[PDB]
């Protein structure tokens, strides 16, 4: 009923859709868009299912166009979603893309073989390698933005609506998307004083989703790279290996950081953060967990190839969840990792 009214208002907002698509259901929603399943007829092909993405009408034109440019320039290959057409009336923009029938990550998580986990990660890295080659930092890598069809072995990374460009990005439009402080003696202690409390706040990029943000995002590092997407891929992999999703459950950035420190260790996180300009102080030290023991204890070692997960899986996970973004594995490197033996 609510979806029914949403659909009616979508045809009203972009009337050309009424003469092309039968809008059937809402299939996804985020902060910046809603996605609908529709049917259409092709001029020179069969009937096709189509995903219609309605962008929030507060989106700046440059942000809308940059998303389209990601889809046209980088998409349509290597497990990256492409674009068929786009319809605009005033501030209402609808992107039409091929529909891929896809699994619920939560529903299939504990009904996946270990080999299907390998194939899923391989195909995620193909998509990330592709977008990173164009200097796209996706920022919102997570299962709901990585469509997976198990039976067809088809995959699609979606949603460039939060992307940022690297300094040398090939997506031109991403380059254009939107009381002096004193030192004090509280530094690296549990103290507060009027000097440090009265400083302006640091602003750094953080568009994304709770539980998938890398430590350098959570701690407001101004210089973020494609490595943040590799962290997010590591979080997906952690969910696959542990059987837990969402793995992290945090309503604010520092709670998310505290959860990461319970997994990867406070001393380890503190040491890595110092390399990117951040001092972290914890009141109580928390040890790093062994990744194999953590995942197997959370998943329950059982049938599926899951009684004999190779060391290479947890080694790759350690490299994706590298607390230091400079050393964190890249997508091109991940495809060469021995975890993927017997697949190339």
């Amino acid at each position: 009923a609510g979806v029914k009214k949403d659909i009616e208002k979508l045809y009203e907002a972009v009337p050309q859709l009424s003469n092309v698509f039968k809008i059937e259901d809402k299939i996804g929603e985020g902060t910046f868009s809603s996605v609908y399943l529709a049917t259409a007829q092709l001029q020179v092909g069969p009937e096709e299912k189509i995903a219609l993405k309605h962008l929030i009408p507060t989106s700046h034109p440059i942000r809308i166009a940059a998303e389209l440019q990601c889809l046209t320039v980088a998409g349509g290959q290597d497990n990256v979603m492409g674009v068929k057409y786009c319809f605009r009336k005033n501030d209402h923009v609808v992107i039409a893309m091929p529909y891929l029938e896809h699994e619920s990550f939560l529903d299939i998580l504990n009904s996946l073989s270990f080999q299907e986990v390998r194939e899923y990660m391989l195909n995620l890295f193909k998509a990330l390698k592709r977008i990173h080659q164009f200097g796209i930092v996706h920022r919102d890598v997570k299962p709901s933005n990585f469509l997976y069809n198990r039976r067809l072995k088809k995959y699609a990374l979606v949603d460039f609506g939060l992307a940022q460009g690297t300094h040398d990005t090939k997506i031109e439009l991403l380059k254009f998307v939107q009381p002096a402080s004193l030192t004090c003696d509280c530094y690296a202690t549990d103290k507060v004083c009027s000097i440090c409390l009265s400083r302006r706040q640091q602003v750094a990029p953080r568009a994304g989703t709770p539980g998938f943000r890398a430590p350098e995002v959570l701690t407001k590092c101004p210089n973020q790279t494609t490595a943040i997407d590799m962290w997010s891929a590591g979080v997906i992999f952690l969910s696959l290996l542990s059987g837990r999703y969402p793995f992290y459950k945090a309503s604010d950035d520092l709670t998310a950081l505290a959860q990461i420190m319970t997994i990867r260790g406070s001393r380890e996180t503190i040491q890595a953060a110092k390399t990117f300009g951040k001092s972290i102080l914890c009141s109580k030290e928390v040890p790093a967990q062994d990744l194999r023991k953590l995942c197997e204890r959370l998943r329950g070692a059982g049938a599926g190839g899951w009684n004999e997960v190779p060391d290479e899986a947890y080694d790759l996970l350690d490299k994706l969840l590298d607390l230091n973004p400079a050393s964190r594995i890249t997508a091109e490197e991940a495809l060469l990792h021995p975890f993927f033996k017997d697949m190339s």
């Binding site: 003469n19 507060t58 400083r199 953060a273 001092s279």
Partner: protein, 102 residues
């Protein structure tokens, strides 16, 4: 204490500060810090109004903002030329029906 903005953080806490000491630290104080719960059944986690970019304006209610003079002006402006220029390169390949006449 609070009156003089001076003291020590009640534990437990996490404190993050830029190393050059140019920005306000940010803090986390919780009654209970995170604990890895292995007993909760999988797939549960082991840890178990907005802004308009066009108008450069915070709003209290989205639908009222979409009706503001500022936003309607923008929505009908030539500011979407950058979008239209990309759309003009795409190929429309769907069947388009005439509007149905009652």
């Amino acid at each position: 204490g609070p009156g003089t903005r001076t003291g020590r953080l009640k534990k437990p806490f996490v404190k993050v500060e830029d190393m050059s000491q140019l920005y306000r630290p940010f803090y986390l104080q919780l009654t209970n810090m995170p604990f890895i719960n292995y007993s909760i059944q999988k797939p549960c986690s082991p840890f178990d109004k907005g802004y308009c970019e066009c108008c450069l304006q915070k709003y209290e209610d989205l639908e009222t903002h979409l009706l503001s003079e500022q936003h309607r002006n923008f929505a009908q402006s030539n500011q979407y030329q950058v979008v239209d220029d990309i759309v003009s390169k795409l190929v429309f390949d769907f069947v388009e029906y005439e509007k149905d006449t009652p």
